[PDB]
């Protein structure tokens, strides 16, 4: 009965995409009881699903390399939709490890076999993960192309509220990347209301963070700090004290408190973020708190350029542009127009690289 268990793996995937944890645990136990007395590469499909299941668990509540060992072991002569799941899931994992070059390579290999995918929901999953990594790479038009396909499929179906809220995140954030904050606030707000409907604390705090990015773009720095403070509260009050994404909120608050000329609170916030970033062992976010410190405290420019180059070798030209924007503006306000020239030039370089 190899088809009966592969069918149950399909249902396991369906409950994974629906973010139904009890159903996912039920079908994990059912399938695992079948694997013992079973006749293929089905063991890879099972392992592939154990991998995807783990990514859902990690997202809900913060090793995996053992599952990567069973995935990377004996992948000889792949074909069909199993090859699609292979490249797609490996791309999701590479995206979670700040490996953008590899995640894009895997996503494109999963895209070649997309006609093998019959479920509109599964294609919506692919389109959303591709639009996500395209927003992070600031390929705004490509990200919009994929995100509208994904959200149309999700909204056509029911109970995919979590994935629709994330699609609202991507849509609004691309509008924000086009200097349209008032066009991005409706989507972030809509996602916030639906985030408190399913009582998804992580999504609520992320909605507060994106809305604060809108107030930051409009230079309403107090309202931005309000969103950042309440997002930090929501994260560190609901079991998300050690989730890496909370650093993105602390970091923005560090800029905002620093921009409001509150040097002391900014000193403390940059310290909170640098310490927690070292604790969670995230070198990327750590060097980004190092930039804000070297810029807003002791004006260390060689350190700024060392960090900007580091961030470029990680293919994170978006964060390179954001930080060079911070430095060029800060030095321009201090009448230091020579070094302000240098960092505005780096913003131009990053924008051209993104193309």
């Amino acid at each position: 009965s190899s088809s009966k268990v592969g069918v149950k793996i399909n249902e396991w995937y369906k409950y994974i995409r629906l973010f139904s944890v009890p159903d996912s645990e039920i079908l994990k136990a059912e399938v695992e009881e079948e694997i013992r007395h079973m006749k293929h590469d089905l063991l890879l499909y099972y392992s592939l699903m154990c991998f995807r299941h783990q990514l859902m668990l990690d997202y809900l509540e913060p090793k995996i390399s053992d599952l990567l060992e069973k995935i990377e072991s004996s992948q000889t002569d792949l074909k069909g939709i199993l090859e699609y799941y292979f490249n797609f899931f490996r791309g999701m994992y590479e995206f979670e490890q700040y490996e953008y070059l590899n995640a894009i390579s895997f996503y494109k290999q999963a895209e070649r076999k997309l006609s093998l995918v019959a479920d509109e929901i599964e294609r919506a999953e692919f389109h959303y993960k591709v639009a996500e990594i395209y927003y992070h790479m600031k390929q705004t038009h490509m990200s919009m192309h994929h995100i509208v396909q994904a959200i149309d499929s999700y909204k056509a179906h029911e109970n995919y509220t979590v994935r629709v809220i994330q699609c609202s995140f991507v849509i609004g954030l691309n509008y924000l990347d086009m200097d349209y904050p008032e066009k991005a606030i409706p989507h972030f707000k809509n996602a916030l209301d639906k985030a408190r409907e399913i009582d998804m604390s992580r999504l609520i705090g992320s909605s507060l963070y994106n809305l604060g990015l809108c107030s930051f773009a409009e230079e309403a720095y107090e309202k931005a700090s309000e969103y950042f403070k309440e997002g930090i509260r929501v994260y560190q009050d609901n079991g998300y004290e050690h989730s890496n994404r909370i650093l993105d909120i602390l970091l923005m608050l560090t800029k905002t408190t620093f921009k409001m000329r509150n040097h002391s609170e900014g000193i403390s916030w940059c310290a909170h973020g640098l310490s927690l970033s070292k604790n969670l062992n995230d070198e990327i976010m750590a060097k980004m708190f190092e930039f804000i410190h070297a810029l807003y405290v002791d004006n260390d420019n060689e350190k700024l350029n060392s960090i900007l180059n580091y961030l470029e070798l990680k293919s994170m030209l978006s964060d390179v542009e954001d930080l060079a924007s911070d430095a060029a503006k800060y030095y321009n306000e201090k009448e230091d127009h020579k070094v302000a020239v240098a960092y505005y030039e780096k913003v131009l370089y990053a924008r051209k690289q993104i193309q």
Binding site: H136, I165, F169, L173, R202, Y209, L213
Partner: peptide, 5 residues
């Protein structure tokens, strides 16, 4: 970047 969750 922003949270694409």
């Amino acid at each position: 970047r922003g949270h694409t969750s």
